[PDB]
Design a protein around this nucleic acid. Sequence first.
RNA 1: AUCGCUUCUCGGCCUUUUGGCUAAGAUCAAGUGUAGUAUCUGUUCUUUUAAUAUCGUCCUCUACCGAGGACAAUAUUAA
RNA 2: UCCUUGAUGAUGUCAUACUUAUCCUGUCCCUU
RNA 3: GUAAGAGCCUAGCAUGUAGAACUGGUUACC
RNA 4: GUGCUCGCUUCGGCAGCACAUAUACUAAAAUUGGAACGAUACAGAGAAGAUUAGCAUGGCCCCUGCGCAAGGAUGACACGCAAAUUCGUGAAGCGUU
Lengths: 111, 118, 290
Amino acid sequence: AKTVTKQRVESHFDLELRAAVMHDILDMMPEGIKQNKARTILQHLSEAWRCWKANIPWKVPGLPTPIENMILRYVKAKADWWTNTAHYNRERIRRGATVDKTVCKKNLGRL
Amino acid sequence: TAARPTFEPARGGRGKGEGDLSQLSKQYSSRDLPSHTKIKYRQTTQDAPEEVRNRDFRRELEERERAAAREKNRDRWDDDVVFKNCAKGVDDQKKDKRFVNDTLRSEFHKKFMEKYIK
Amino acid sequence: NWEDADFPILCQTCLGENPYIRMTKEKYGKECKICARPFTVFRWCPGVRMRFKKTEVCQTCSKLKNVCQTCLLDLEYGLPIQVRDAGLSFKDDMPKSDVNKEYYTQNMEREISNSDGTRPVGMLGKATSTSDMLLKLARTTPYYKRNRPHICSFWVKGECKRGEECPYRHEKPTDPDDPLADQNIKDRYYGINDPVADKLLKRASTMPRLDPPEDKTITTLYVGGLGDTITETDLRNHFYQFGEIRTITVVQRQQCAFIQFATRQAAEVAAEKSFNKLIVNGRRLNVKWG
RNA sequence: AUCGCUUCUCGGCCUUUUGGCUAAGAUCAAGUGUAGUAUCUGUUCUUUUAAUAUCGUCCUCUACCGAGGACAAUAUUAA
RNA sequence: UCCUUGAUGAUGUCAUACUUAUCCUGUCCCUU
RNA sequence: GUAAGAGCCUAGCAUGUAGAACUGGUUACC
RNA sequence: GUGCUCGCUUCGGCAGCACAUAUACUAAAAUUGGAACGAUACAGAGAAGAUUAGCAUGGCCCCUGCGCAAGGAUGACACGCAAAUUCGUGAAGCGUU
Ligand SMILES: [Mg+2]
Ligand SMILES: [Mg+2]
Ligand SMILES: [Mg+2]
Ligand SMILES: [Zn+2]
Ligand SMILES: [Zn+2]
Ligand SMILES: [Zn+2]
């Protein structure tokens, strides 16, 4: 049972975020839904995250408000994780602590 | 294709300790050596369940609540210059008391972006 | 999985003629010859001039097929697996290809461990219906000639430097120009083309059996070997089982008894049940048609 | 009007369809010359000398066999 | 009843034209 | 333009097994 | 085998008693199968033009490593004529009760 060490961290976070969204949309759909359409909502969530990072205002013209609110909720959660990781690595790069070179490039790109 | 999501996890019950100890292997990690082989228990002064059982928690909780509220209560030449005093009554305008649930409009983030970009 | 069981599943002509047996238990000694998952090896000496036999297959591979773990013959009748499956049905269908074999093994072992641990798991309901021809060629006395040391392969080349101290036999090996000498382990286990089973079923084909009426509807029974120490009022009681019994002609000068029943079916039956089997008044009662 | 077959139009199913993540993961550029491969077009086989290399007999060694030496022409190419 | 076996040469090869796991580049012209 | 089969294509490491089956039958009435 | 026997009774034999009490995966084998790179031809490395860092995910895929480290081409594979329950309109032509 492999450990999430240092190079699995973002892939494990984005692995678990998808699972939480899957459980929420399986609980959120009412009783007579065809139980398809999970992949499309996951793509809407990935596109909403890209539009958050690009500072593009994200609005789908027809979309149910529980799905739209849930996507906004999880996009705010990934925003918080992204931003707090950026603050932490910037304080580390400022003090001179042991940092990777890739985390310096990633941190510049986030800042 | 190659790049694909999951849509189902890997199930447990088929490796190293799951049903027959994976048929009794002779392989063991360095994290699986004996370590902390003695459970520490709560002593009589700490919070042992003999002492927790007879205690009335509501009276002590109300007393500590009262003491905390009481502590918080007892704690609390060139006159010709073209611009006059611009800050008259600005008594520091307590932004540092506010806490905002927004990582872009927080006070810590505004201090961050003020510090780290010139 | 492993196996890890106590006291193997043995017959009596492999376990020796001594009531006092020493055996050793090795915990995960060998692998199964069929299952290839390792088991507990039990090893004993049968007698005095015997071979030190040991168990060859798991407890599970003997639970599935009701055999002894070293000779792979039946526990109850003592015949090969192909003969007993010939005198019964064959609905086990254990897979022989690899991954299917281990998958079926895992699942049937789960079914065993989800039970008491005493019965043949699938062979029980078909083991209720028994007493076919296999009871009429089952070996009565133990065949202690299996428990016998191998031919000394230094003596075959005439170089046995141990001589009289060699525990291996100085006698003839069997001619390989013989169907009886191929004998795979798995062929003997799965009931496929076992030549011992071929000879036993051939012996079986020859054997006496109840036969059909010469002409239609005839329920006439020609009974030979009556004897004059019996009475015809008991026959009826031992016969009524079948149905209302038709004609009952009696002749004590030839000691032959003719019988008649309502249906020919019942007469065939009485042959079947009756032929080469029935004895009453401690005296064999022989039957024929016409 | 009803039942059946055949044109013709249209509605609903058509997530049966975009199968992750990171610093939009990153970057953003060419010409000439040779060599190799493939395709197309045109036309060929079978029935003396120079250079290089190396079975018989004899001799010696060691246990009929093996090794070493010498000797007797042979093969290729061109007119 | 066309005949009716124990099997050591056959189709090629060469030349020209069009696109690389090689080959060499860090590189420029032209008029008022 | 190097481990990726596939196959080949030749190998090599485990095994010291289990097992040998042969026996037979009578006939009679108006 | 050894010792003791107020054993016959000689130093020969025999008798009695005592102690001593079950090795061996039984082969110097016969067999039986699956297997060593690696050579032989072929074969050529993911991300919607090209050149490319990678991190994962899943399990009848493994290799190196003591590794719950990290590598193995992002280790390989994954590339799918991606069809799962259950239908109706309108006129138009033809035959029919
Ligand atoms: Mg890796
Ligand atoms: Mg790469
Ligand atoms: Mg991988
Ligand atoms: Zn077994
Ligand atoms: Zn047995
Ligand atoms: Zn011998």
